[PDB]
Amino acid sequence: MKKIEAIIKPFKLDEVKDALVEIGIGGMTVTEVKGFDFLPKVKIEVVVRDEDVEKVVETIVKTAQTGRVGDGKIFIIPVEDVIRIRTGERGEQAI
Amino acid sequence: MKKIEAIIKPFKLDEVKDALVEIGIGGMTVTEVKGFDFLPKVKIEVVVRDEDVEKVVETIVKTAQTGRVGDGKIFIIPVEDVIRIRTGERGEQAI
Amino acid sequence: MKKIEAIIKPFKLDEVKDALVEIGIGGMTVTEVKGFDFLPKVKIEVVVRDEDVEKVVETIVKTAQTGRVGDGKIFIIPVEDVIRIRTGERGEQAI
Ligand SMILES: [Cl-]
């Protein structure tokens, strides 16, 4: 599994959220952040199976891109395990 | 060492914070976030020794669980090093 | 590449931001957080080449330190890839 941390322009949040739901993303965590003068940005985090990382990255790039400076970045970070708090399920069962 | 990133329901913050302090957690970073309509959630991050990860995960699951949808998730992420800003101590000495 | 996550005292943000720009950091993501009673802190995230991690860590420690309790911590987390949303560039080209 991998954590995908994407920092995007605020006005792109609805579009990116909808696109991710479209490709099957079950849950996401969003945080208001600032970056670059510090400009407001939005962080989106999802944790997905290894085989689904590329489709997610492609979807975010295509939906969040404007071609202008400050579009943001995406980091792929390893995750050794995920646990669903409601049930105690782990791994594939927790995503 | 491992980073433990837990996303929980807001009203569970005091209970989870107290439980973690109870099991010996020395420090934690909390962020107001949103997730799933975006509902308010709270992110808690702690970095602990490998041998202490399971006890922390169990404590968070037991204290943050309600059995209802949206209880959240916990991600275990590898950390290659930790540095204490005040002293420059690293590793076990920085936790 | 590595993600560097630093949690510092709020009043140190301008100084740390300037120092990082001074040593060549191209972009950073800042989040208002709380930690330890929860006191306000600021999280700074940068992703850099492996050979630049130590210089960044040293710069943050030197600029953010006060010698007093609560100065914060720095976590070094592996990053398997970085993607620049504007162009689709990855790796060294995306930093
Ligand atoms: Cl992370």
mmCIF file of N, CA and C in Angstrom, chain C residues 10-55:
data_model
loop_
_atom_site.group_PDB
_atom_site.id
_atom_site.type_symbol
_atom_site.label_atom_id
_atom_site.label_comp_id
_atom_site.label_asym_id
_atom_site.label_seq_id
_atom_site.Cartn_x
_atom_site.Cartn_y
_atom_site.Cartn_z
ATOM 1 N N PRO C 10 5.437 28.618 16.197
ATOM 2 C CA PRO C 10 4.883 29.588 15.245
ATOM 3 C C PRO C 10 5.737 30.806 14.929
ATOM 4 N N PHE C 11 6.300 31.429 15.955
ATOM 5 C CA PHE C 11 7.079 32.639 15.713
ATOM 6 C C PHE C 11 8.382 32.399 14.950
ATOM 7 N N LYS C 12 8.781 31.136 14.811
ATOM 8 C CA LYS C 12 9.998 30.799 14.072
ATOM 9 C C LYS C 12 9.751 30.583 12.567
ATOM 10 N N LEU C 13 8.493 30.601 12.130
ATOM 11 C CA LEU C 13 8.185 30.351 10.720
ATOM 12 C C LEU C 13 8.899 31.244 9.701
ATOM 13 N N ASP C 14 8.857 32.558 9.895
ATOM 14 C CA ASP C 14 9.527 33.450 8.948
ATOM 15 C C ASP C 14 11.023 33.144 8.862
ATOM 16 N N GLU C 15 11.670 33.008 10.013
ATOM 17 C CA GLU C 15 13.110 32.718 10.055
ATOM 18 C C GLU C 15 13.459 31.406 9.369
ATOM 19 N N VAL C 16 12.693 30.357 9.669
ATOM 20 C CA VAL C 16 12.964 29.057 9.061
ATOM 21 C C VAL C 16 12.687 29.060 7.564
ATOM 22 N N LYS C 17 11.592 29.699 7.149
ATOM 23 C CA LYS C 17 11.236 29.795 5.741
ATOM 24 C C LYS C 17 12.367 30.504 4.978
ATOM 25 N N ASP C 18 12.840 31.623 5.520
ATOM 26 C CA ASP C 18 13.920 32.377 4.866
ATOM 27 C C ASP C 18 15.217 31.570 4.767
ATOM 28 N N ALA C 19 15.546 30.863 5.833
ATOM 29 C CA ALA C 19 16.761 30.042 5.862
ATOM 30 C C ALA C 19 16.706 28.928 4.805
ATOM 31 N N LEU C 20 15.536 28.302 4.663
ATOM 32 C CA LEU C 20 15.376 27.227 3.704
ATOM 33 C C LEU C 20 15.495 27.776 2.289
ATOM 34 N N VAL C 21 14.907 28.943 2.049
ATOM 35 C CA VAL C 21 14.995 29.552 0.732
ATOM 36 C C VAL C 21 16.475 29.846 0.469
ATOM 37 N N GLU C 22 17.175 30.311 1.503
ATOM 38 C CA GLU C 22 18.606 30.634 1.400
ATOM 39 C C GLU C 22 19.445 29.443 0.955
ATOM 40 N N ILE C 23 19.147 28.260 1.497
ATOM 41 C CA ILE C 23 19.901 27.075 1.113
ATOM 42 C C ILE C 23 19.375 26.397 -0.151
ATOM 43 N N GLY C 24 18.472 27.075 -0.844
ATOM 44 C CA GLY C 24 17.983 26.548 -2.109
ATOM 45 C C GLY C 24 16.709 25.742 -2.204
ATOM 46 N N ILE C 25 15.934 25.678 -1.126
ATOM 47 C CA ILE C 25 14.671 24.930 -1.150
ATOM 48 C C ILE C 25 13.692 25.620 -2.096
ATOM 49 N N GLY C 26 13.201 24.878 -3.087
ATOM 50 C CA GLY C 26 12.295 25.442 -4.076
ATOM 51 C C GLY C 26 10.828 25.577 -3.698
ATOM 52 N N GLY C 27 10.338 24.700 -2.825
ATOM 53 C CA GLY C 27 8.943 24.784 -2.432
ATOM 54 C C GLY C 27 8.726 24.166 -1.069
ATOM 55 N N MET C 28 7.686 24.615 -0.374
ATOM 56 C CA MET C 28 7.381 24.050 0.931
ATOM 57 C C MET C 28 5.892 24.157 1.216
ATOM 58 N N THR C 29 5.398 23.246 2.046
ATOM 59 C CA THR C 29 3.980 23.204 2.418
ATOM 60 C C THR C 29 3.920 23.430 3.924
ATOM 61 N N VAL C 30 3.097 24.393 4.327
ATOM 62 C CA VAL C 30 2.984 24.792 5.722
ATOM 63 C C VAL C 30 1.571 24.572 6.228
ATOM 64 N N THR C 31 1.444 24.012 7.428
ATOM 65 C CA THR C 31 0.139 23.745 8.012
ATOM 66 C C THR C 31 0.110 24.232 9.461
ATOM 67 N N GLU C 32 -1.010 24.821 9.861
ATOM 68 C CA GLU C 32 -1.175 25.250 11.253
ATOM 69 C C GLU C 32 -1.615 23.992 11.993
ATOM 70 N N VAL C 33 -0.916 23.661 13.070
ATOM 71 C CA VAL C 33 -1.225 22.445 13.831
ATOM 72 C C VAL C 33 -1.130 22.774 15.322
ATOM 73 N N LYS C 34 -1.301 21.770 16.178
ATOM 74 C CA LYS C 34 -1.183 21.978 17.618
ATOM 75 C C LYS C 34 -0.386 20.804 18.155
ATOM 76 N N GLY C 35 0.285 20.994 19.279
ATOM 77 C CA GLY C 35 1.030 19.871 19.820
ATOM 78 C C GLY C 35 1.499 20.073 21.240
ATOM 79 N N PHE C 36 2.357 19.159 21.692
ATOM 80 C CA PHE C 36 2.956 19.192 23.020
ATOM 81 C C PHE C 36 4.079 18.156 23.070
ATOM 82 N N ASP C 37 -2.300 20.031 27.497
ATOM 83 C CA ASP C 37 -2.506 21.282 26.767
ATOM 84 C C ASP C 37 -1.906 21.263 25.359
ATOM 85 N N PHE C 38 -2.714 21.643 24.373
ATOM 86 C CA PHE C 38 -2.261 21.712 22.989
ATOM 87 C C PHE C 38 -1.859 23.148 22.666
ATOM 88 N N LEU C 39 -0.608 23.335 22.280
ATOM 89 C CA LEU C 39 -0.109 24.658 21.927
ATOM 90 C C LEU C 39 -0.009 24.750 20.398
ATOM 91 N N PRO C 40 -0.205 25.946 19.839
ATOM 92 C CA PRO C 40 -0.114 26.104 18.383
ATOM 93 C C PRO C 40 1.324 25.883 17.914
ATOM 94 N N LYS C 41 1.468 25.155 16.810
ATOM 95 C CA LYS C 41 2.765 24.890 16.213
ATOM 96 C C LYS C 41 2.565 25.051 14.708
ATOM 97 N N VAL C 42 3.652 24.968 13.953
ATOM 98 C CA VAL C 42 3.526 25.058 12.512
ATOM 99 C C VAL C 42 4.310 23.902 11.933
ATOM 100 N N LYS C 43 3.689 23.214 10.983
ATOM 101 C CA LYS C 43 4.351 22.106 10.298
ATOM 102 C C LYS C 43 4.878 22.612 8.973
ATOM 103 N N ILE C 44 6.122 22.252 8.666
ATOM 104 C CA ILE C 44 6.728 22.599 7.393
ATOM 105 C C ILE C 44 7.117 21.270 6.748
ATOM 106 N N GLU C 45 6.752 21.105 5.487
ATOM 107 C CA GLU C 45 7.124 19.896 4.748
ATOM 108 C C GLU C 45 7.867 20.294 3.484
ATOM 109 N N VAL C 46 8.984 19.618 3.234
ATOM 110 C CA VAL C 46 9.717 19.804 1.997
ATOM 111 C C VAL C 46 10.126 18.405 1.559
ATOM 112 N N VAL C 47 10.318 18.221 0.260
ATOM 113 C CA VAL C 47 10.783 16.936 -0.240
ATOM 114 C C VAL C 47 12.035 17.289 -1.027
ATOM 115 N N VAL C 48 13.141 16.635 -0.684
ATOM 116 C CA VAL C 48 14.419 16.955 -1.312
ATOM 117 C C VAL C 48 15.220 15.723 -1.698
ATOM 118 N N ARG C 49 16.280 15.939 -2.470
ATOM 119 C CA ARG C 49 17.151 14.842 -2.875
ATOM 120 C C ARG C 49 17.862 14.287 -1.642
ATOM 121 N N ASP C 50 18.196 12.999 -1.682
ATOM 122 C CA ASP C 50 18.853 12.372 -0.541
ATOM 123 C C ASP C 50 20.083 13.133 -0.071
ATOM 124 N N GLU C 51 20.910 13.585 -1.009
ATOM 125 C CA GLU C 51 22.140 14.292 -0.657
ATOM 126 C C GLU C 51 21.936 15.663 -0.013
ATOM 127 N N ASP C 52 20.704 16.157 -0.027
ATOM 128 C CA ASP C 52 20.423 17.455 0.551
ATOM 129 C C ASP C 52 19.704 17.399 1.901
ATOM 130 N N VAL C 53 19.354 16.202 2.360
ATOM 131 C CA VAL C 53 18.630 16.062 3.626
ATOM 132 C C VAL C 53 19.338 16.656 4.842
ATOM 133 N N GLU C 54 20.588 16.262 5.052
ATOM 134 C CA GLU C 54 21.348 16.756 6.193
ATOM 135 C C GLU C 54 21.466 18.282 6.255
ATOM 136 N N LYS C 55 21.752 18.923 5.122
ATOM 137 C CA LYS C 55 21.864 20.377 5.105
ATOM 138 C C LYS C 55 20.516 20.993 5.519
#
